Every structure is written in structure tokens, then in C-alpha cells.
Amino acid sequence: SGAIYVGNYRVVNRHLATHNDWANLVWEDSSRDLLVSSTTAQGCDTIARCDCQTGVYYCSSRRKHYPVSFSKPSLIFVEASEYYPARYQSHLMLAVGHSEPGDCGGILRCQHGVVGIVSTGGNGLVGFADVRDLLWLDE
Ligand SMILES: CC(=O)Nc1cccc(NC(N)=O)c1
Ligand SMILES: [Zn+2]
Numbered sequence: 001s002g003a004i005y006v007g008n009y010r011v012v013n014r015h016l017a018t019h020n021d022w023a024n025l026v027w028e029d030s031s032r033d034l035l036v037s038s039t040t041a042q043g044c045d046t047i048a049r050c051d052c053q054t055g056v057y058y059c060s061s062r063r064k065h066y067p068v069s070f071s072k073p074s075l076i077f078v079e080a081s082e083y084y085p086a087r088y089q090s091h092l093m094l095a096v097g098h099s100e101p102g103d104c105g106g107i108l109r110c111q112h113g114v115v116g117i118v119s120t121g122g123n124g125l126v127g128f129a130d131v132r133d134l135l136w137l138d139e
Contacts, residue, residue, distance in 0.1 A: 002058070002105025004114055005043035006137050011036050013104045013119060013129070015083035031090040033119040033129050036137070046113035048132050055115050057126065058106040059098055068095035070108070070115075073130035078120050089120065091130045099126035 004011035012021055014028055014035040021037040028035040053072065056065050070093040078089045082101065093108075099121025106118040108128045120127025131137065 001060075001102065002107060002117065004045050004047070004107070004117065004131065005039070005041075006045045006047055006114075007043050007139070008039050008041075009036050009043060009137050010039050011117070011131055011134075011137070013117060015081075016104060027134075029090070031088065032092075033084070033089060034091075034117075034131070036134075047134070047137050048110050048112035048115045049135070049138075050110060050112040050115075050132065052110035052112065052115065055108050055110040057095070057097070057108040057118060057128065059103055059118075059126075060106055061100040061103050062098055066097050068097050068108070068126070070095040070128060073133070076120075076127065078127065079122070081120075089127070089129075091133065092120065093128045093130055095126050095128070096124060097126045098124070 017035040024037040116128035119129040
């Protein structure tokens with residue numbers, strides 16, 4: 001699990017969004033595994049605005065932060081999970097590293113702030129849903 005808090009926005013894995021997230025929907029994209037809901041409290045996180053391909057992600061299944069190199073956001077085929085059928089996920093970045101389902105929502109960061117959240121994994125790969133293109137999160 002894990003969320004991003006910026007302005008009056010909460011960014012979560014679409015597959016982990018609660019009834020409260022859906023009752024306060026700002027935007028959702030099923031192909032990206034992302035959902036943003038409205039909050040009453042002011043978020044403390046900064047979204048990276050950059051095209052960095054190196055960073056550090058939190059891996060709850062190892063209680064550790066790992067430094068990774070990752071691909072630029074793209075359309076990648078993603079095998080079946082407990083939450084989606086096999087399909088193409090958009091705006092997805094891959095790194096070589098450890099990921100398990102409950103690692104979803106772990107934050108990837110560079111010097112410029114939050115890059116994205118863990119969304120896919122297995123076969124020694126971790127996939128992160130990019131949030132850097134969602135410029136409207138900042139105002
Ligand atoms: C370990 C494996 O094969 N599945 C895996 C790994 C990381 C994240 C997800 N994502 C998801 N279940 O939505 C799935
Ligand atoms: Zn950056």
C-alpha cells in the first residue's frame with residue numbers, strides 16, 4: 001500500500017482505491033492503474049517535473065529503499081494479477097528489482113520529488129505508474 005498527498009489530492013493505485021476515493025473521484029485511468037481523489041487537508045508531497053531515469057523506491061516486502069534505473073513511461077503488456085486481467089498498461093516504467101502485490105503504492109523518488117508508485121512486478125522486474133505528466137496535481 002501507499003498514497004501520494006499533494007495540494008487537495010490523494011493519488012493511489014486504482015486497484016487499492018477505497019469507497020471514499022470513488023465517492024470523491026477527481027480522475028481515474030484503468031490502463032494506468034491510477035486514481036486521484038479529493039481531500040480536505042493540504043498534501044505535503046512534491047511531484048517531480050523532469051525526465052530522470054534514476055531514483056530510489058520503497059519495497060515493503062523487504063522493508064528497504066533500493067536505487068534503480070528505470071525506462072521512460074510507455075505502453076507495456078502486464079500479465080494477469082488478482083486485480084486486473086492480462087492487458088497493456090500505459091505510462092509504466094520498468095526497473096530490475098524486487099516487487100510483490102502488496103508493494104503497490106511504494107514511492108519512487110529522484111532529486112525533484114515523487115516520480116511514481118509501484119504498480120507491477122514479478123520475474124525480477126518492478127513497474128512504476130508515472131505521475132510526472134499530471135501537471136494539474138500542482139495547482
Ligand atoms: C509478484 C507478481 O507476480 N505480481 C505482482 C508484483 C508486483 C505488483 C503487482 N501488482 C498488482 N498485483 O496489481 C503484481
Ligand atoms: Zn527528477
